[PDB]
Amino acid sequence: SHVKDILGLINAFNEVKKITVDGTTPITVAHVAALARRHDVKVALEACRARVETCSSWVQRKAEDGADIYGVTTGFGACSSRRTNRLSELQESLIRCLLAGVFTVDELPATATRSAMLLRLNSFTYGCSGIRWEVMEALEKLLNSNVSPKVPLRGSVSDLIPLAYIAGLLIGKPSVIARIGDDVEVPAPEALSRVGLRPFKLQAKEGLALVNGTSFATAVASTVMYDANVLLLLVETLCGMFCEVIFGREEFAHPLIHKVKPHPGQIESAELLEWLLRSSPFQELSREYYSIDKLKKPKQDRYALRSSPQWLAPLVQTIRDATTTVETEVNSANDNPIIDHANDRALHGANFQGSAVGFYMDYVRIAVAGLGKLLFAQFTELMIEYYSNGLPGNLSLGPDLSVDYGLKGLDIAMAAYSSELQYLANPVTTHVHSAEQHNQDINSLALISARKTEEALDILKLMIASHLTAMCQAVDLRQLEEALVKVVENVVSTLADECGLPNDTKARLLYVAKAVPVYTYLESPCDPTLPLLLGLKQSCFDTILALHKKETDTLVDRLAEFEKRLSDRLENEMTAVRVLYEKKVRIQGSKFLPFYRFVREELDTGVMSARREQTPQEDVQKVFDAIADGRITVPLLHCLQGFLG
Amino acid sequence: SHVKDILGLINAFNEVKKITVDGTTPITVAHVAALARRHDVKVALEAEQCRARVETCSSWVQRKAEDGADIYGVTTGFGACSSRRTNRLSELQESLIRCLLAGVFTKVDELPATATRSAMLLRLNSFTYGCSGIRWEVMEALEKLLNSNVSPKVPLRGSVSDLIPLAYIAGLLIGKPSVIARIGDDVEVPAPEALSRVGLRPFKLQAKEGLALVNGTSFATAVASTVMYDANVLLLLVETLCGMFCEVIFGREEFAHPLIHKVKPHPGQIESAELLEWLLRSSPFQELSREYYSIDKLKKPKQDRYALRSSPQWLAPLVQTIRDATTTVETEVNSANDNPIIDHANDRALHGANFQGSAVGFYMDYVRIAVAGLGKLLFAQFTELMIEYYSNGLPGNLSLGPDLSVDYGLKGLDIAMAAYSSELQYLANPVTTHVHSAEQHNQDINSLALISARKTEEALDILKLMIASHLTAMCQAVDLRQLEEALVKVVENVVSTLADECGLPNDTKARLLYVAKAVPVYTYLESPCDPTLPLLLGLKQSCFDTILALHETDTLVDRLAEFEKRLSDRLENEMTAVRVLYEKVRIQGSKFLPFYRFVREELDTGVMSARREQTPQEDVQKVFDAIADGRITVPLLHCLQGFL
């Protein structure tokens, strides 16, 4: 299952300490994300060296013999007609011309730049590039010392200009500003000195080798794909939590349904959902709910839950397939020419072309928009009393609803999130211009597309944060609801006794106490125009009619007393249970307990109301930060403990 | 290799006579497309395989409904209305069809018969899994209607994925007077009349039968199936033609070297390069390219432009998208897309959402982007071929001339290629991002698969247009390269012989013959002895050089002036003669000979010029039609025979 694969990505991200770059060992997207986000993670360039040295001396030797090789003794791009013997000045002229971005401050963040540096280092280990081993060591050192150039955000059609700033750093160009950690910014020469390095003078092919790859697009795509995998599993898992709070029917995930429509992502998401909902205590409440007035209640759930495994199927498959493609690019010699030193040949091709990453970045952005729409639809159902099977509108606790609009702000924001997200998911690759003196008449735009997918994922994180917060609210409302109904039942039953009401009367009134959604009358339980009293008055007329001629005047006396005793005691009992619940059980047997505990206990939150001074912002920000920084994976892995061994 | 998978699809499309429908035998996209396009192809519904399953499920549903079991859409209202129960079993089903006959014929716009018959096939196949509760007899009628070429007229729009369009198939089956049915190509009659013409009687719907007939993804999956078959064929065609482009543009075949792609191993990159290396190995045109770059070596590009050199890298995601989508579409073809799913063995009506065409929907969006990427590659390749700065000797616009002021060659096709690519890029925006909360907010997510499939189909029509033009242009360039080779020899011969006749020194002779070799012939074909055009310019500078190098000089100047006069009355005539001869050979040794032979001989075309009366339209239409009806696959399979 893809579930176990993603769990494997998360463990690797958590547990990796050194990244081995040797030209043989695969770097996964988890390794890239770990390098970028965990500074205790070090790069270990393991000598591979022999290959690199053979390669660079072959290039240098051939260049000096005046051999005809692109970008070595030849001009660049549309300029391969021009030959030259000025080997080092050719290379330097290329870097000078590519330092051409502008700071608008918008920039490629250090995380992406350091990732790009790792990726360039990795490409070099295959021994096709002709770069000196010493330049590779310098990259390892810069990576391990938190040194990276400030890089302008835009300019690549995929990554000459952005990679030129890495080259600029290595050759100590004064105009190239370099970060050292989070605050320090110094010119390249000073940056090199602070970590015990000297500026390089570019040898044959070295300028081109440094700039002629897909490192930036693939770096952004790697962290994009790591996040997409985590958030995907998070979304699939939360569909189960949605089912629990919405009073869904868990049969939507029954294996036979998906066996007969066997998209792998359909089978696997449902298999997960079946396992999460098996023996659910909330599914117990659900079944009990639909057994009461069965023929007045929906036979099927709405699409946002029932159709989730079918919806998720292409999204799972897109995210998993894109991960393979991105990792293939990570572990590739993206460079040109390809030096075949064993067969004494330089091969001319186009491994700098980031089209594999570009196209898959477009697809993933559409899939991410699809995940967002799923969340939007679930969230929407949850806010509307007509679709939430007992829950209050906007998940407002009240009881005074005139001054508690619950999660309405979060609801409005969810539409704003989803709308921008859908917009973002238009393709980037359909916008290819004929570029660079029409030499680059196809170009992938992979970095631009990866940037937009990253932005889409930022929005997805907001939507997940809001959704999980709303569901924790719904858990609290469902647990309070169960407790409130039991209180109403007890008060009604004990008062039926005190007033000496017949058994026919007692059973009719107790049915009303069980059947009526408590949130429809919580605001004012003894309001005669609200559903509890309406139902009781209806049953009281029905009991008078059924017991007539089988003492009417005394019955009415006792029914009037029942109402008056209810008026003096019911509200207080309902208030007391709610005040108790608010001071601080079904979730305890649910597979979603780790999520509820995490949000409530570890993040320090509570059921939302007018009595809780924390704003919706303050609650959701906490959840969002924990999703953004990876802490959310702890309750996730706890939740999935034991799934498929 | 995917190349072998696509060749397998093509062969299956040509060769299938009967499509077996039995609940176990998979239906491929080639099968669906063959049914739609070849009316000799018949459906075989197998009783032994699945009849028992179908009838067991049918009797289960009818019995449980009669005993008043609570099951969605059999004793229950539809969509947002599942709260309402009824025992009016047959009228519940009848009311659903009535409500769904709600499409509109605009202008007319309609789902074509090919799509409608494909959907009938797919709905029939869905029923074979025995989860639907439909009567075997209804399935037999579907088989008979399919084999008799009877299908309803269906409105284009109304589905969010396929209730409204499928209700028209249900309407035909129940003999609704308002539903019009086609019988073959010529007749259309009301549904009651169509049924009796093929010996069928109108069905009265039983429990679940209305819902079973409409609750599928049959139309989206029908359109997607033919979409995916075409995407596979056109992809292989596009890949293959990258080799032909290399041959005529004077590319360096080294771009396809296996080591380059071994170190960047996207499967589509490796596989497309493998194909290209094979196509270009020992090519006679690649020998010409080699000679070309050996003359004035250091003044010509060391590398080709991206439209060729970067083609395997570009093709990689496109290959993989098209192949993965084929798998996904075929999975949908071979699925019980219906609800509820009846588990008769365990006495359970399972409530889910297999009517949701999301797998098809999202993958249609991806394919349309990939098709757009294929179009962009063709556009960039076509553009290079039209511009003399980038075509390495070929005349601008591939204008034969000789008088270029009255021959603008393939300029019309060039402009059209931009128009095609532009619309295609626009079409490739996604449909799946436009989900509306639908049907009383019951359908708060919906696939839009049919709409997306339709747009991908439109994108493939434009791709066909682009392939047709591109192939046409490359045959033009083939004729121009072979004519170039002959013309150069003629000039070399005239210069060599006239150097002797005029008794020129061996220094002069060799220097003049190098000019005849080096100067691109199409730069002076218009007026070969025009003193301002490159041939005479090169001979003039060489004539000053030989005077300076050998400096009796008066006699040398006399011999050079006699050379100029003798050239000025003999050269043009000899060139005209060979050109006329050609208008009445390295392609003979090329893997792309089948394509050239097909376009020139079988389709009866020739080199384009002012002397050929046939218009670009007439030439490209022939090629388009051959792509559209599948005749293009013959030269393609011939071109590829022996590969792997």
Place this chain on the structure above:
Amino acid sequence: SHVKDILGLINAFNEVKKITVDGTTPITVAHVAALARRHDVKVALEAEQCRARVETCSSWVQRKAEDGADIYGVTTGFGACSSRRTNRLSELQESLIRCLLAGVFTKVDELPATATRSAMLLRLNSFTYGCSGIRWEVMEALEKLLNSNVSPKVPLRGSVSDLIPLAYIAGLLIGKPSVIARIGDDVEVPAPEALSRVGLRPFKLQAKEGLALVNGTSFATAVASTVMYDANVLLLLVETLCGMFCEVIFGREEFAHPLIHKVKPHPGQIESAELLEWLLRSSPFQELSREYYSIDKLKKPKQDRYALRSSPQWLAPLVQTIRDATTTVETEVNSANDNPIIDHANDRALHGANFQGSAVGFYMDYVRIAVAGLGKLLFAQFTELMIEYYSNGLPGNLSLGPDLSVDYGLKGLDIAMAAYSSELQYLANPVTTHVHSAEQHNQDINSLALISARKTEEALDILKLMIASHLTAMCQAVDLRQLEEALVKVVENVVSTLADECGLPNDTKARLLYVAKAVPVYTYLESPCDPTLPLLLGLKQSCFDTILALHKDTLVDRLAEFEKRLSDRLENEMTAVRVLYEKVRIQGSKFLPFYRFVREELDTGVMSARREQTPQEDVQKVFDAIADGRITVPLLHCLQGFL
């Protein structure tokens, strides 16, 4: 002319000292942009003009609420909750703010202070119309917060258009501890502390006040105002630089001829052509162009390519879109965007939807499309400029060289221009097509105007990058055209005097002087005496022609001497003039202010391997100048006297 209008906007942006907020005086996009960008610009809320009507409306709302009148969001719930009544007037309003403080600070991303302060201005302005029921004191507080540079930190997303983001301004006013306020550039404190520092106390919301504070289009319209100001300025800038493009590319100015555009009278087409006709009328560069096409006339294009020739036709809809959208945004700026509308003069509350930012949302989509169109125009021009086949004499990549093997000129910028245009085109897809049924399906149409304005803002950022690059390339090309002219004269002089020294006839001399004038100098600058390059090719061809012609020994001797003396004198003298140039026709050009601004004020020079400043260093200067408005000085100088 729209050109006068845009100049009026630029002048107003620079000249304004006080923004009068009084319920009658229009606020323009220039005024908003000025408040946002010039901290010395102050708000003046005028009591004399609107205080009276504000207090009448204030008193009306409060008394009706206390009387228990049934008025939306005053004695009723909000949005989908209008069926719920209350008499808890203040708590109703405070529950609305509590509920809308629901944004998240993502990585930090936020609506910037410029946008927030503009939104504060626009909200205050809304209130001056006297339909809102807000207290005068609250308006005074907004004025005071604006002039003291206090503004809340606002999350970027959450509005479908501007409840959530406006709730942070309301949160500041009522002293929410959770709301962080900026004071100037380097101070951030909780709202209660920020109110204290400016002498204000937290407000207690009265009837309707919460809703009044949040129920407008202030954020969408704030970002749209600065978007439109920028769009006007950058539009005029692009239009003007089409004239500079014509000059450097050797264009034919006939494309701007008044009759062409009279017979296809789109106002943007007429007006852009009129500007371009005037910019090029007495151009020294157009004289060079006329001379260029007179040499080998029948071997050179009769027409320019579309990027120049089709520019008025192309600019026409873009001019009109940006102008009309400006009108639309200002109508919104000067509107009572609020609900209910209190009609106190007729004793009634009016229930509508003036909070709907659809006018702005839709026009933001149109403008983003227009801005993409302006980008495509700049890309096409830049592309032509970099390609020798299409530049009419200029070197490829505008590489000075002379050694082209180690000077790739502006190739970096050329690649960047494709990236800029590519992303720009993608951005131009509409936002308004993505309307979700929102807020318990109460907001089943919503404008998404803030989201759209943000995307149009991002498009304009990219357009600024493209303009900076384009102008930098055109300045490069000015230098290259001027050097070209000075180089051709040296070659003509060297050929002429050496033909004299060597005693060559007048037939020979005239032929050789023709070659020197006709051959584009940049095709042989790398090595002028290389026998395989166009100068010596043309001279060798001419020398053979003069030998056959004058035929009836020493002539061959004198020509061999000419060719030898050429390889000794020519390169050194061409080098000399170039070296002098690195250490004129622009002086008569209307685009002198731009060239002077970029070269002198910004301190740049012709780009080459000898100039150590990187393209980044040069273009950043030009971009910074465009971004901060300094570019309008050269723009206004250039346009002086145009009427």
